Structure 1
């Protein structure tokens, strides 16, 4: 019940919402059916439109008008945004040359430059070039301020998961808005786009920017706007709030536009109908900047122009139906469209079986436009698993397609030509970023970055301490003229041991054998230097990775590679090696095929053993430093040490062997040498974070050798590829991946072909940021370079996407 019988007199768009059943006058009351009776009359005036004309100049104040052109409107803070232009001979902000804003130029009583976030729904990155003719205010913000060629959204590339990521710095799996439709089995409640359930606070996790601000005593404008409040009124409300007295005035504001997403759904991203919504957005930006200039705030306010996601071409006739694959279609609930999520229709039917649902959906038709995944097998870069609201079965849908349960769902539920929600690496889903103001750089282009990074920067812009989030604070310092945050390297928690020769061969009973007794002060002086770290500067280019947790591990040096060997996990945490452009690939000699050699630096009790692999019929083994890339026949023996061995399913060895035999050398040829760091990952609870040993769910049968869920590599080279990787004077270039360690290659529909047709395609799909590998391993990489730490943080958040150029 709301006793809507109170009044909005002097309360229009009041900043704190008043508790039921007193009636509300805040920018969200319309959404809750709870506004006072006079809200429309008082708060949504429209008389006379939004622009001053010649004849209203100096008019007698008439309180009915939407905005005012009377002489007092500046002191009252409610002129039309073009007031000074029409009635005082002033120029529009877009007509003025840009002039660097070196310092904030603020009216008295402003303690800090305000931040205004102008968020646009569906604003695809290429609109900045393609619509440039019809967006002069936006093109000025972009060319005068700081801009990226595009900004990567999070998955799924839907509206609320992305806007709430902007507000919290968290992945959707952590903030909890994981789609535009959700079931929470703990609440036993559902969230939908239409409805009042979506307003319940318990859907919304983390701490959004407005709550961070408020807790730290910075006032905030209310971010959410009811759909029927027109854009001109949203802008005028923000400008009026900007005229409040110092003690009441917010420092942070948001504007939001439903366009161009609205029209994009109907007409497609580049439909001829799309020119007008882009014109109209630009004109709204023009109103804001003219209003700020009127208030003398246009060289004081930081303005962010930011999208939530792009828009792709999608039509009714590109729909795949689960009824064309499954017979039990009525025993499932599908969340449909640009991604799929599948669960059982009833918790009381124990015949529904996820494993056979997946198998019925896997590589079933030659041109199949979706791929089913258990959520924990999705590419780790999506970070889309660790939330009870995400269903175990997921369908990644090819761009341009939908998935639906039954054809009837599509014509009885064509109507649309655009949609979004696809994989966040897809070029059509990329969106925009522009920062303009005293704290942003002048005329600067920065590389593309992910939207999870903005919350930190918005906190920096406001002098706030960010709540814990998924951004890497300092990675976007290069966007800012000042207020940068000066990160420091995490402290190493565990220091390594440097073991020497301590064990005789006969102490090992590992059931390993090698044909190596086919056995000189010239070459034994050398073996010794190699085991002391004499070639370490060649293979360890950026320092040893730091171990950020408590553990026991050994550095092991070799001619061709260096490793950090875990006495707890019985395998390396990392193995580092450099392949120059000139390197040669050799084979594994026939007599060495099954060779495994005890490492006399590491005790039997902390080594793997060969008998465990012999007795584990499902599990085989691979090596981290590959024998194919040994620098000489004698160095090759080092590659067969039991301390370089890791457990691998046979199906996985197919991938790993191709990467190591063919692709490392291809990359070294293309990139003028590479440094590779590879290693195992254990993430059995799929939370994106390194497992402790007591979380391991699978071991090599009858042993304490844990089986990894993934294997990573980080491949680093010189950004200026005229310089060799091992002799690089400036910025680095990196690509990385996190390959799932699976017992089948069901993910790859072409796997029965030659590895040259499918392996690299798999690796690309599992591309990753160094930062993702850091979370998964508790390691910190690049600790010793000649680069600034901020630059290294930007490199660690880089993602190599393999899309073509936008």
Structure 2
């Protein structure tokens, strides 16, 4: 119970912990209905608006006013933000020319530059194009500070998952907020945007910035604001907090605006009606900077201007209905809109038939505007499966469309695949720790938690950022990364056997400098493997998993594609370097009527026939479904060369991935669940390829002087091509479309393989970390 009869005198927006039976005066009290009876009258003053006028300058201090224009207001830290402009002849911050802030210019008492996070909901990255005509203050922050052309949110591209990701550095599947709405089958309880269930701490995992700060003795302002508190009051409160005594003043602050998300939904992102909310936000930014300038803090504070996701054109007329596909939609619950999650209406309903539902949802209309996925089949880049709150059945909805259960106020929405252009949001950093007038490549919001920790002198809790990959955004306070140490050193075995030693059922009728350009990948777990050299490729062959962990080769721009001769079609030769006991056998493949096999280094690209024979080794062989082989062969035969021609050579590294429990991490042997029939050859869940070349395309891959260029993929190893609706046609009609959807970061592959790439290069380790987090989106 809360004794509401208490008072908020001298307590407005206080930062100290206060809980029942005591009554509260913090920015969250309304949300708990636990405010003192006089909170509104004493703390939410509104009288006379938010701006000084000339007829108010040097007034007698009246406590009834929202903000003040009296002589003493400055030291007391509660002037209206435009006080000195109206009353003391000063200029607005936005009318001042930019000057590089080479070091913090903070008043005495300030040990570190404070950090203010200014988050805007639904701010599409492309809104920034509207420039200073519409958003002069924001434009100044962007042009004078450090900005990215856009920032990639996490999927689903909705508010709660993204704000909590920002706060924690974690994927939703890790922090637990996997949607604005969700059902937890263990709680048997439902979380909603609106309502009280969300206030239960049991939903919220990881460790958000404010907790990290607090636990390391750094004071945080309260990040959250009750929706009824006007933005002008949030700003004044932050400014007041910054005016607090040295022993009370917080170091990190957060402002939040629900705009332009609201207007985006109502009018769509390209509506002329969008200009007005963008103007309002800029005005609020202006109040903040005017306020900091008045406090002599405008060259002391680090400001981060950041969105949670973008906004797409979505109207009533573009809605798919499950009732068009399924007979009994009243028996399922659908989490609807710009994504789909399906479960039975009655939890654990035994008649629920997901294979049948998926079958009715698969490629049933030629223009079908969604695609069903078992969650383990979703592109790995989304990192959206390893949580009990994520339904097994998912629908990835096409941009601009909605999915509903069964049969216009809105013109905009968001939620789609996070590589979609319209979902990208904004990042600008301005202040002494950020660089001056610097543009940086786009990056993912999971990286920001580490940077904010760096900005505040904190040690980050475990998270999914790659600490160091964003050092290039900072003047100082950078993080010196250290290379992880190799766990398993490789055997280099010479010949120890002869062809006569092998009973496998197989019948056949200066490498490094040229094929391993960035050093060998380090193995970061306990295991046993052999380096194998060949004329055209090198490989790290695992004696445990009976295949390479990686095969590495370089294809020159001018290199030639050859065929596999008819008599070599089914040729597999044993490898005298590797024990018969540590080899696969072709008999398992003959017996397994469903599983075929493939080669990591493509015979099609060997230099000479004597080299071709290297490719057919039993140690270059991997288990592949015929369905997948359609994809792989086309990749090996047509695409690698096309990449080599367009990029002036490519270095390729390919290999298997085992992720049977879909946690995005390298499986241990115990977790692998499928083997080639009658054998112990484990079946990969995915195959990756990492394609690297020179950023300066005028130099060949093998002779690159400077920065690298990378694209990668993690292809699902599946027994059919159901995901590809046009798979019945020629591979030139569908394979690349599939590969684009499964684009990936090198970092993703590192998590899934336990390997560490690019250890030997001429680049800084920080620059390399940036490279590993890059995602080629094809947008």
TM-score of the superposition, structure 1-length normalised?
0.96
C-alpha distance in 2 between matches for 1:19 and 1:63: 28
C-alpha distance in 2 between matches for 1:701 and 1:142: 59
CA contact (8 A) 1:710 1:738 kept: yes
User: What whole-Å deviation, never above 9, does each CA across 1:678-731 have from its counterpart, x for those lacking one?
Assistant: 000000000000000110010001111000000000000000000000110000
Q: In 2 relative to 1, CA 793–583 (structure 1 residues): closer, same or farther, beyond 3 Å? A: same
Offset, 1:54 = 0.5
CA contact (8 A) 1:17 1:26 kept: no
User: What whole-Å deviation, never above 9, does each CA across 1:77-97 have from its counterpart, x for those lacking one?
Assistant: 100000011111111000111
Offset, 1:376 = 0.4
Name the SS of the counterpart of 1:341 in structure 2: strand
Offset, 1:131 = 4.8
C-alpha distance in 2 between matches for 1:94 and 1:347: 56
User: What whole-Å deviation, never above 9, does each CA across 1:387-445 have from its counterpart, x for those lacking one?
Assistant: 000000000000000000011xxxxxx12110000000000000000000000000000
Which stretch shifts more, 111-120 or 330-339? 330-339
CA contact (8 A) 1:131 1:278 kept: no
Name the SS of the counterpart of 1:704 in structure 2: coil
Name the SS of the counterpart of 1:642 in structure 2: coil
CA contact (8 A) 1:540 1:562 kept: yes
Name the SS of the counterpart of 2:55 in structure 1: helix
Name the SS of the counterpart of 2:532 in structure 1: strand
C-alpha distance in 1 between matches for 2:341 and 2:691: 34
C-alpha distance in 1 between matches for 2:349 and 2:378: 27
Which stretch shifts more, 44-53 or 339-348? 339-348
Offset, 1:23 = 1.2
C-alpha distance in 2 between matches for 1:535 and 1:694: 35
Name the SS of the counterpart of 2:304 in structure 1: strand
Which residue number in structure 2 is paired with residue 529 of structure 1? Answer: none
Which residue number in structure 2 is paired with residue 454 of structure 1? Answer: 448
C-alpha distance in 2 between matches for 1:207 and 1:556: 44
Which residue number in structure 2 is paired with residue 440 of structure 1? Answer: 434
Unaligned segments of structure 2, at least 5 residues: none
C-alpha distance in 2 between matches for 1:2 and 1:474: 46
Offset, 1:348 = 5.2
CA contact (8 A) 2:172 2:384 kept: yes
Offset, 1:226 = 0.8
User: What whole-Å deviation, never above 9, does each CA across 1:314-363 have from its counterpart, x for those lacking one?
Assistant: 00110000000001212211110000000112245322111111111000
The reply on whether 1:427 has 2:403 as its aligned counterpart is no
The reply on whether 1:624 has 2:603 as its aligned counterpart is no
Name the SS of the counterpart of 1:277 in structure 2: helix
CA contact (8 A) 1:17 1:24 kept: no
C-alpha distance in 2 between matches for 1:757 and 1:35: 63
C-alpha distance in 2 between matches for 1:188 and 1:691: 30
Offset, 1:466 = 0.3
Offset, 1:21 = 2.6
C-alpha distance in 2 between matches for 1:22 and 1:300: 37
Offset, 1:247 = 1.1
Name the SS of the counterpart of 2:167 in structure 1: helix
C-alpha distance in 1 between matches for 2:16 and 2:428: 30
CA contact (8 A) 1:320 1:403 kept: yes
C-alpha distance in 1 between matches for 2:345 and 2:437: 55
Offset, 1:746 = 0.1
C-alpha distance in 2 between matches for 1:132 and 1:324: 48
User: What whole-Å deviation, never above 9, does each CA across 1:447-466 have from its counterpart, x for those lacking one?
Assistant: 00000000000000000000
CA contact (8 A) 2:184 2:388 kept: yes
CA contact (8 A) 1:167 1:455 kept: yes
User: What whole-Å deviation, never above 9, does each CA across 1:261-296 have from its counterpart, x for those lacking one?
Assistant: 011100101211111000000000000001000110
Offset, 1:3 = 2.0
Which residue number in structure 1 is paired with residue 483 of structure 2? Answer: 489
User: What whole-Å deviation, never above 9, does each CA across 1:482-510 have from its counterpart, x for those lacking one?
Assistant: 00000011000000000000011111100
CA contact (8 A) 1:119 1:308 kept: yes
Q: Tell me which of 673, 677, 688 is aligned to 2:649.
A: 673
Which residue number in structure 2 is paired with residue 466 of structure 1? Answer: 460
C-alpha distance in 1 between matches for 2:271 and 2:20: 45
- Tell me which stretches of 4 or more aligned residues in structure 1 moved more than 4 Å: none
Which residue number in structure 2 is paired with residue 264 of structure 1? Answer: 264
Name the SS of the counterpart of 1:556 in structure 2: strand
CA contact (8 A) 1:542 1:784 kept: yes
Offset, 1:75 = 1.2
The reply on whether 1:589 has 2:583 as its aligned counterpart is no
The reply on whether 1:693 has 2:661 as its aligned counterpart is no
User: What whole-Å deviation, never above 9, does each CA across 1:33-78 have from its counterpart, x for those lacking one?
Assistant: 1111101100000001000000111100000000000000011110
User: What whole-Å deviation, never above 9, does each CA across 1:370-400 have from its counterpart, x for those lacking one?
Assistant: 0000000000000000000000000000000
User: What whole-Å deviation, never above 9, does each CA across 1:569-598 have from its counterpart, x for those lacking one?
Assistant: 000000000000001100000010000000
What do you get for the CA RMSD once the two structures are aligned?
0.7
Q: In 2 relative to 1, CA 195–507 (structure 1 residues): closer, same or farther, beyond 3 Å? A: same
CA contact (8 A) 2:524 2:756 kept: yes
C-alpha distance in 2 between matches for 1:799 and 1:348: 38
CA contact (8 A) 2:606 2:612 kept: yes
Which residue number in structure 1 is paired with residue 731 of structure 2? Answer: 755
C-alpha distance in 1 between matches for 2:735 and 2:583: 31
CA contact (8 A) 2:660 2:685 kept: yes
Which residue number in structure 1 is paired with residue 683 of structure 2? Answer: 707
Offset, 1:2 = 2.2
CA contact (8 A) 2:546 2:681 kept: yes
Give the 5 Å matches for 1:176-191.
176-191=176-191
Which residue number in structure 1 is paired with residue 3 of structure 2? Answer: 3
Offset, 1:750 = 0.2
Q: Tell me which of 766, 769, 777 is aligned to 1:790.
A: 766
Which residue number in structure 2 is paired with residue 661 of structure 1? Answer: 637
C-alpha distance in 2 between matches for 1:352 and 1:789: 51
User: What whole-Å deviation, never above 9, does each CA across 1:605-650 have from its counterpart, x for those lacking one?
Assistant: 0000000000011100000000000101110000000000000000
Name the SS of the counterpart of 2:589 in structure 1: helix
Offset, 1:32 = 1.5
CA contact (8 A) 2:131 2:139 kept: no
C-alpha distance in 2 between matches for 1:376 and 1:440: 39
CA contact (8 A) 1:719 1:731 kept: yes
User: What whole-Å deviation, never above 9, does each CA across 1:193-237 have from its counterpart, x for those lacking one?
Assistant: 110111111111000000000000000000001111000000000
Count of residues in correspondence between the two structures: 777
TM-score of the superposition, structure 2-length normalised?
0.99
User: What whole-Å deviation, never above 9, does each CA across 1:665-689 have from its counterpart, x for those lacking one?
Assistant: 0000000000000000000000000
C-alpha distance in 1 between matches for 2:16 and 2:553: 59
CA contact (8 A) 1:131 1:275 kept: no
C-alpha distance in 2 between matches for 1:504 and 1:725: 37
Name the SS of the counterpart of 2:630 in structure 1: helix
User: What whole-Å deviation, never above 9, does each CA across 1:127-163 have from its counterpart, x for those lacking one?
Assistant: 1113541100000000000000000000000001000
User: What whole-Å deviation, never above 9, does each CA across 1:550-584 have from its counterpart, x for those lacking one?
Assistant: 00000000000000000000000000000000011
Which residue number in structure 1 is paired with residue 235 of structure 2? Answer: 235
C-alpha distance in 2 between matches for 1:633 and 1:643: 18
Name the SS of the counterpart of 2:417 in structure 1: coil
C-alpha distance in 2 between matches for 1:132 and 1:84: 23
C-alpha distance in 2 between matches for 1:258 and 1:657: 49
Name the SS of the counterpart of 2:619 in structure 1: helix
C-alpha distance in 1 between matches for 2:505 and 2:511: 31
CA contact (8 A) 2:660 2:667 kept: yes
C-alpha distance in 2 between matches for 1:62 and 1:683: 66
C-alpha distance in 2 between matches for 1:247 and 1:564: 58
CA contact (8 A) 2:511 2:538 kept: no
Q: In 2 relative to 1, CA 404–131 (structure 1 residues): closer, same or farther, beyond 3 Å? A: farther
Which residue number in structure 2 is paired with residue 251 of structure 1? Answer: 251
CA contact (8 A) 1:476 1:794 kept: yes
Which stretch shifts more, 568-577 or 23-32? 23-32
Q: In 2 relative to 1, CA 347–61 (structure 1 residues): closer, same or farther, beyond 3 Å? A: closer
Name the SS of the counterpart of 2:99 in structure 1: coil
CA contact (8 A) 1:718 1:732 kept: yes
Offset, 1:17 = 3.7
CA contact (8 A) 1:546 1:781 kept: yes
